[PDB]
């Protein structure tokens, strides 16, 4: 069972206000037919427009909440809302657009999905809290058929053009008018009691309800993210490489080693309490320090309370030496800390909008991260950029312009002139650091941290 059987039952109770008289006994096969689409017994990679929760989780980057609200059923205008915040009014003749016929509305739908999704996914998953009008409006902007490739590249087709009779992916679809072979999922099939607003507001206070279709579309995708990534966590699902994943992760390991090594050299802590990932390894294996590990999986709901991590009776004395919290999200860090905290507000192709201010960070695996909170860092300060190295000054084996920097902490810079090797190493470390920061990671340290204490390690 890889795909969702068209003969699976679909509960129609949520559809009966917009569709009175709808049969209680309904399959996906019959629903797709009621929506005006013919599947023709096609074994060509598109077995059903609807997908399983497991297939939806694997394709979370394609999620687009979609809701349709009647403004006044072929006679009345419809308000089409998307989790991008867009509201389009389609006439059958927070961005609110005036009423227009379907022939122009569909062009706008293709442009919007193509721009939102081209750098995220190879498809679209319409995330619904289905009541009827959204399912019956699909025939006005969606075409289905066999799986196809783009006319201009090797990617799968996501759009169709009636003007040219061709197919395109999200990257080559300018001027295309139809969404081709989209996927969709109805959250209301997961067994909920009560309406969308009541279930969404149980877990989220960041998204409100003005009463427009995009507010519902946003709430729908948020509730789906809460169910699939907050209350249920799956770190075994792998996600494709769409950007700088490898470089960011490599940069994070470089910055961690640099920052921890320098903290140990500058303040000579006898003990380090490493709180976080139970699979963590010593980031400074040669350091003299007593390294003690404490297990805490990435929190996906609320940040950990420091009282629960440290108290209830371990070294017991977390106040001795230094605490290292590398992506271990806590409510209030102790003063003796070295911290890497992902800033959920960051705009990138890796970071998707999440639940209750949190974000869904997708890099190899999916990690719902609780909302960034500046008050967690009141006992610390922002860690300044610096490069430290005790390695010999020797080139071995790309061109050169002399480096002058007060933040290149090396024997050669103490001696008045940065050597070529430390200049190359400094520029590469500065690049890794900038990549990490721009990806969304923030670095914080104990107030007494001073890089001036690193110069005396060259005696
Ligand atoms: C690699 C990349 O940038 N993206 C968005 C993709 C991700 C999964 C499948 C296909 C694609 C594609 O568009 O090729
Ligand atoms: Zn293409
Ligand atoms: Zn929400
Ligand atoms: Zn040097």
UniProtKB/Swiss-Prot annotation:
It is found in: Host cytoplasm; Host endoplasmic reticulum. Inhibited by Remdesivir antiviral drug (GS-5734). Residues 355-369 are annotated as: GpppA-binding. Residues 49-230 form the ExoN domain. Changing residue 19 to V: In strain: Omicron/BA.1, Omicron/BA.2, Omicron/BA.2.12.1, Omicron/BA.2.75, Omicron/BA.4, Omicron/BA.5, Omicron/BQ.1.1, Omicron/XBB.1.5, Omicron/EG.5.1. Residues 239-459 form the N7-MTase domain. The active site is at residues 67, 69, 134, 211, 216. It comes from the Viruses. Mg(2+) 1 binds at residues 67, 134. Zn(2+) 15 binds at residues 200, 204, 207, 222. Zn(2+) 14 binds at residues 150, 153, 169, 172. S-adenosyl-L-methionine binds at residues 274-280. Plays a role in viral RNA synthesis through two distinct activities. The N7-guanine methyltransferase activity plays a role in the formation of the cap structure GpppA-RNA. The proofreading exoribonuclease reduces the sensitivity of the virus to RNA mutagens during replication. This activity acts on both ssRNA and dsRNA in a 3'-5' direction. Interacts (via N-terminus) with DDX1. Interacts with nsp10. This is Guanine-N7 methyltransferase nsp14. The gene is rep. The chain holds residues 5949 to 6449 of 7096 of the full protein.
């Amino acid at each position: 069972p890889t795909h969702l059987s068209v003969d699976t039952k679909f509960k129609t109770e949520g559809l009966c206000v917009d569709i009175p008289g709808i049969p209680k006994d309904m399959t996906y096969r019959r629903l797709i037919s009621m929506m005006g689409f013919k599947m023709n017994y096609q074994v060509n990679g598109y077995p059903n427009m609807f997908i399983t929760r497991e297939e939806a989780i694997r394709h979370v980057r394609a999620w687009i909440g979609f809701d349709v609200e009647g403004c006044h059923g072929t006679n009345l205008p419809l308000q089409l809302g998307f989790s991008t915040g867009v509201n389009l009014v389609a006439v059958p003749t927070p961005l609110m657009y005036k009423g227009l016929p379907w022939n122009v509305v569909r062009i706008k739908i293709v442009q919007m999905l193509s721009d939102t999704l081209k750098n995220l996914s190879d498809r679209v998953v319409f995330v619904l809290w289905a009541h009827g009008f959204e399912l019956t409006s699909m025939k006005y902007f969606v075409k289905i058929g066999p799986e196809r490739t783009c006319c201009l590249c090797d990617r799968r087709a996501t759009c169709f053009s009636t003007a040219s009779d061709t197919y395109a992916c999200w990257h080559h679809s300018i001027g295309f008018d139809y969404v081709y072979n989209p996927f969709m999922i109805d959250v209301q099939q997961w067994g909920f009691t009560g309406n969308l607003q009541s279930n969404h507001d149980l877990y989220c206070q960041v998204h409100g309800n003005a009463h427009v279709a995009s507010c519902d579309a946003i709430m729908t995708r948020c509730l789906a993210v809460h169910e699939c990534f907050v209350k249920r966590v799956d770190w075994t699902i792998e996600y494709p490489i769409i950007g700088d994943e490898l470089k960011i992760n490599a940069a994070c390991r470089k910055v961690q080693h640099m920052v921890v090594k320098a903290a140990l050299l500058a303040d000579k802590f006898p003990v380090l309490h490493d709180i976080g990932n139970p699979k963590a390894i010593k980031c400074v294996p040669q350091a003299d320090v007593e390294w003690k590990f404490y297990d805490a999986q990435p929190c996906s709901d609320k940040a950990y309370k420091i009282e629960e991590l440290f108290y209830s009776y371990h070294s017991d004395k977390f106040t001795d030496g230094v605490c290292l919290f590398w992506n271990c999200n806590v409510d209030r860090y102790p003063a003796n800390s070295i911290v890497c905290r992902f800033d959920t507000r960051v705009l990138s192709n890796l970071n998707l909008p999440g639940c209750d201010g949190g974000s869904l960070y997708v890099n190899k695996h999916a990690f719902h991260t609780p909302a960034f909170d500046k008050s967690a860092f009141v006992n610390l300060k922002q860690l300044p950029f610096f490069y430290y190295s005790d390695s010999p000054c020797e080139s071995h084996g790309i061109d050169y312009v002399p480096l002058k920097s007060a933040t290149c902490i090396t024997r050669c810079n103490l001696g008045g002139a940065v050597c070529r090797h430390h200049a190359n190493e400094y520029r590469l470390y500065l690049d890794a650091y900038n990549m990490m920061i721009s990806a969304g990671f923030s670095l914080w340290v104990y107030k007494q941290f001073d890089t001036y204490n690193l110069w005396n390690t060259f005696t």
